[PDB]
Amino acid sequence: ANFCLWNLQPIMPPSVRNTWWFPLLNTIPLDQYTRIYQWFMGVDRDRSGTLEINELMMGQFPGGIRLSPQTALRMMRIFDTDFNGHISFYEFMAMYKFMELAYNLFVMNDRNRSGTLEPHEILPALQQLGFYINQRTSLLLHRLFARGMAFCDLNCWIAICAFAAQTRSAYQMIFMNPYYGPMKPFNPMEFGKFLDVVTSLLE
């Protein structure tokens, strides 16, 4: 029963191949490729062969996820790895799989089937996903993204997951500066501390 983003067991331009989220693509079995393409086509309202931010805001996603302008921009920042303002099919496959994983995890953690997680339920769920933050940070993420809501509905969960993932992208961008010395092996306990610190900047 594995949801850890750093441990995804296997079941393309350099921009897609050299991202931290590339292993998501390797969890997609052949039969799912065409199903994801049908989903892509649904979201691509102007049939351009690419997803634009407006289309992200109007799309339906796994589990009925929908995206605020802010979360859609996060999804762009994570998955638009050639920085062209468009999501290609390959970038979308990873975005899709990320959403699917996050949705499945939400459902598993919604044990009373309320359609929400309580704020104290957020930490262990994020830990399953590979984000090793502290309790203070977990409760702050709920306040930051819940828009005043008492609990964490699925869309709020995805907003939170998107911020965590975008912070992972920011980490890779920061640390590929050779000023900081050779790239160290990715360590999720150390990255968790980074996410703790960076989250506090949004408050």
The Cα 150–Cα 54 span in angstroms is 28
Is 121 annotated in some ligand binding site?
no
Q: Which of residues 50-79 bind a copy of itself (CB under 8 A)?
A: 70, 73, 77
3-state SS, residue 80: coil
When the beta carbons of 88 and 167 are compared against a copy of itself, the nearer one is: 167
Per-residue CA distances from 87 to 48, 54, 79, 169 (Å): 11, 11, 7, 16
Is 186 an interacting residue with respect to a copy of itself (CB under 8 A)?
A: no
Query: Which residue blocks in 44-153 are alpha helix, DSSP H?
Result: 53-58, 69-79, 89-109, 122-129, 135-145
136 binds, among Na ion, a copy of itself, Ca ion, none (CB under 5 to 8 A by kind): none
DSSP labels, 165-184? HHHHHHHHHHHTSGGG-SPP
Q: Taking the mean position of all CA atoms in its chain, how far away is CA 60?
A: 16
Task: Name the one range near a copy of itself by CB under 8 A: 14-22, 41-49, 117-125, 178-186.
Answer: 178-186
Nearest distance from C-beta of residue 5 to Na ion, angstroms: 23
Is 148 an interacting residue with respect to a copy of itself (CB under 8 A)?
A: no
List 4, 36, 57, 170, residue binding a copy of itself (CB under 8 A): 170
Is 177 an interacting residue with respect to a copy of itself (CB under 8 A)?
A: yes
Detail the residues annotated as belonging to a binding site for Mg(2+): 44, 46, 48
